Design a protein around this ligand. Sequence first.
Ligand SMILES: Nc1ncnc2c1ncn2[C@@H]1O[C@H](COP(=O)(O)OP(=O)(O)OP(=O)(O)O)[C@@H](O)[C@H]1O
Ligand SMILES: [Mg+2]
Lengths: 69, 73, 367, 288, 116, 116, 52, 52
Amino acid sequence: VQPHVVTVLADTAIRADNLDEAAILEARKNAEQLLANQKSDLDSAAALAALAETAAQLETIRKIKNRAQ
Amino acid sequence: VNAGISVSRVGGSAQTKIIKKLSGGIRTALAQYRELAAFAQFASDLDEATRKQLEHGQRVTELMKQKQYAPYS
Amino acid sequence: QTGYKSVDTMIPVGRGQRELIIGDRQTGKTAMAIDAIIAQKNSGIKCVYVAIGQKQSTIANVVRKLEETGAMAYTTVVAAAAADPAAMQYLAPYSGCTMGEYFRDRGEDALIIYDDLSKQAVAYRQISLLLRRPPGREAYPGDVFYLHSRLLERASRVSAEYVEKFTNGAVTGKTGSLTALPIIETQAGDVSAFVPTNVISITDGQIFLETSLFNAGIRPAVNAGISVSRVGGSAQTKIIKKLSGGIRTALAQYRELAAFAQFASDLDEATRKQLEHGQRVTELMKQKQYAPYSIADQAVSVYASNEGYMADVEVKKIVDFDAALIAYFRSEYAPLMKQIDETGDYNKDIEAAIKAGIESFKATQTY
Amino acid sequence: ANLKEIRAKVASIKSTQKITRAMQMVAASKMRRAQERMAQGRPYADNMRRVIAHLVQANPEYKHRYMVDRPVKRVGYIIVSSDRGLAGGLNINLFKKVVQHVKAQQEQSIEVQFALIGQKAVSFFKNYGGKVLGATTQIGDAPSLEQLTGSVQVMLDAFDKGELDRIYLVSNGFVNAMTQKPKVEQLVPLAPAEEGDDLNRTYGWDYIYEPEAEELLNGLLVRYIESMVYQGVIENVACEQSARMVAMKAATDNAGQLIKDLQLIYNKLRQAAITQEISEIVGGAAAV
Amino acid sequence: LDPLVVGQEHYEIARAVQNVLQRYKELKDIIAILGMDELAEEDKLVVYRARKIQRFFSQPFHVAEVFTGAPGKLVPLKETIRGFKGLLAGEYDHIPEQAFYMVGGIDEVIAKAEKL
Amino acid sequence: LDPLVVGQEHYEIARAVQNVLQRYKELKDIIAILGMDELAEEDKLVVYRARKIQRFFSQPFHVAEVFTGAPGKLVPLKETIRGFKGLLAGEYDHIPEQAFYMVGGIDEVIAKAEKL
Amino acid sequence: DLADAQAQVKQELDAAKAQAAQLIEQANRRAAQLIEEARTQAAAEGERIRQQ
Amino acid sequence: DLADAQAQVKQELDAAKAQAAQLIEQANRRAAQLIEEARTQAAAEGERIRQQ
Ligand SMILES: Nc1ncnc2c1ncn2[C@@H]1O[C@H](COP(=O)(O)OP(=O)(O)OP(=O)(O)O)[C@@H](O)[C@H]1O
Ligand SMILES: [Mg+2]
């Protein structure tokens, strides 16, 4: 506190009336948790898969390039 | 041999009891390993059980090696 | 008119135009033709169906279905089934063209449909081959281009002056016309095959069918992304000519950026709203056979689309929403749609009445 | 030949290209979000350094174990990595820097200790081994300081034993919106660096210390270190986002190149097939 | 496959089973990559139902003379409609798929599930 | 397209225009994805100048006169050349893109710009 | 204000009943009209069948 | 405050009543084509009378 500015460096605080509002902080907690699930659920599923099939069967083409018969 | 495409319509009917009894899980493991071919180069983020299946497939794959002129009873 | 909102919006079809349905196999192409035929309860035109190399079972099924519709009264059909002399099959489309030209030269307007011009081309190939003629690429005598082209151009919309002079004074007012709707079946959706390649430069516009969409249950399975009609809006009614653009641009935007289906959990909101708009309007065209939409029906659907009054309802019931709206107007406001399809004009009074009915429906019974 | 399969391969590659484009856009949005997230942590550390400086300038009579520096016998290291790869080579060059530094230190006969964050680095150092005592994953884009708290306390107590003498934060500095560099900086040993600077007077006014100034300062140092760790985590997450974005762009470009390649070869093959078949036909017809 | 010739209910059941099976197929890869848990609770029941469908399809042959005893099933279309309708609804989406294996109608499935 | 054909200065001018239009084209994707104000202000100048270029290359047509009114404008070289060169000099970076749209020579463009 | 609220409660319940009547009569009428038109068209179908 | 919240319940009840209306509409509308099909068969019965 200063005669003109006061502040609190919060270890953890929530705009709330009581610890009963713990039912509210977990809402954002699990929200970000769900997002953390989502980032993987897309990342590997999109990137790893499609890129896996990309280079997969290309060889049989590159070997038959100059085929005259 | 490429087991992915080579087959016989005859089937185990021309095999003795014991070998037909055994070949099943072998074929299954080969099918599993063939299934996960596209991801074989990424054994860092897959399932552990899938890794076990891949390791089993690797071992049985090496088991299918043999020399020449050296047949087996 | 085709009774197909996508068709009648993005692919207008004018009396006397050559337009091509094309696609791979078992894609309802036959169904597309016959349903287009059905919509001619009020057009006053006549119609001819040409069937080539078909199973008499299929032929008879089509016959029976048409009879159920009763439309086999301003209609005539000839079929060169698969159990027929090749020459019969080869000549048949020309005969159908002859019957069409009869009425066309009577100043009348009509519609005709071919079946498997590829098949009759095959028959002609075989015939020519048996004549020891010099073969061409894929055994095809060159005149196949000439063969088809000399057929297709025989159908068009004529100058009424030609009508008058041919009639020698018998008729003076109308102008004859004949619209050509051929069908080509393709191998794995290729367009580079010689015969289709020949066909393409002939028609005034083409329509593709994509297997995956029907496999995805998209009924009908038309890919508007490549299907075009270079005749412009001149083949639409004024109101549809007005209201097509919204669908045009929304479907565009969607098809460039539809990839985000599973995405847009972090993307900007405008993209999400436009995606929902696109998904809804895309679903809108899913349609069943033998259920033609009157232009008034299409009109109310497009109005509800562009008014965004479906931009607030879940996608899974859009079809239900539409059907309910359809019945609601059909009952409540029959004279309005009566007048509409009498004329097909866009007026502020008209749109105000339509919007009032829509907002009533939303206010009234739910879907 | 099976040309339709070739066309299908082309279509699949096109789809993959669009998916990469989506990857890039999502990465951009995440980048902006995290870039916002960085700035919010400033005032905490700002005011807290201010008051810690006010304290030390008010009380220079003694120091703290986190303020002191004795000769180093062992060190602890904290490295932050993703749960999933594909985001450039940030983990790669990070590991290169850390391994060369550790080799530089072991020839100084000082042991190295670790607590791990991020599955990739977790594996990367488990296989190597090392003197690791902490390991964490499932951090997410907005972790809780709670999640870091166990590890950070582990380092705290280990430092209290005097076993560990320097502790270096290992992360990747967000140099700019496109390029970022690894950073390994000691933090538990602190020296006056803006702690003896940015000041010009000791305020004749001071606060009264309701608890003991010693324990109060100790708790302070706790919070300050934890906040430093937290913001470093934020920054390296943003860097991950950048690297992933760039890699997706490059993937799209390579896809386009391969598309050109395949299309050209397809044209050649179609020509050849047409030639072969027409030759067959003309020979067969010439047979009669 | 047309409602006018097969009725509506059978047609729509076929539609739904097509949808569920094809959706289960396309999730195989990601399931392999991560596992069932990381998927939303949605489609877990879908996976179970698809597996039970596959089991339900296992039909002991009437005439092999030696494959499982040559038992005929020739179950009525209506009974199978009933069973698949219940399975799509989830009437029995609480039983191991094995109970649906190598059998016919719901009666056999329930009897097998109870005997084990 | 050779300095031995259209002359030296004309050739270089055209090459410079091509460079600008390319440069902006590869700019487009970054403008789309990573915003706009995250780039060199010179690059932004390039963007504006290229936009002016594109706005300018279209023109009214004497055939368009009967179509939609708006009688077309005939324009030879040595004015197009000069106007484009001046645009490349950036001496017109104080004007909205509109003055370049549906218009003849640079004199007309400045007339509109003053009148706009 | 509570007395006013009670009066409002009645003022809403009566209108609820009224709109209920409106909707139900509309549905009944529409359905009857539909069954009417239906069997008339099916009668056209039957006579044409006999003519066949 | 509670009474005001309570009026809203009545609107939901009215909506449910309106929803039933659609049930009855569909149910009896079905009966129309039921009759249509059945005596369409009766037309077929006149037909095989004609065939005799
Ligand atoms: N919108 C729709 N809703 C429901 N069923 C449909 C729809 N469109 C088509 N069908 C059904 O799809 C079936 C197959 O279509 P159709 O036989 O016309 O394909 P096709 O290409 O003509 O076949 P072929 O290639 O053998 O000539 C038809 O029997 C029809 O009943
Ligand atoms: Mg057909």
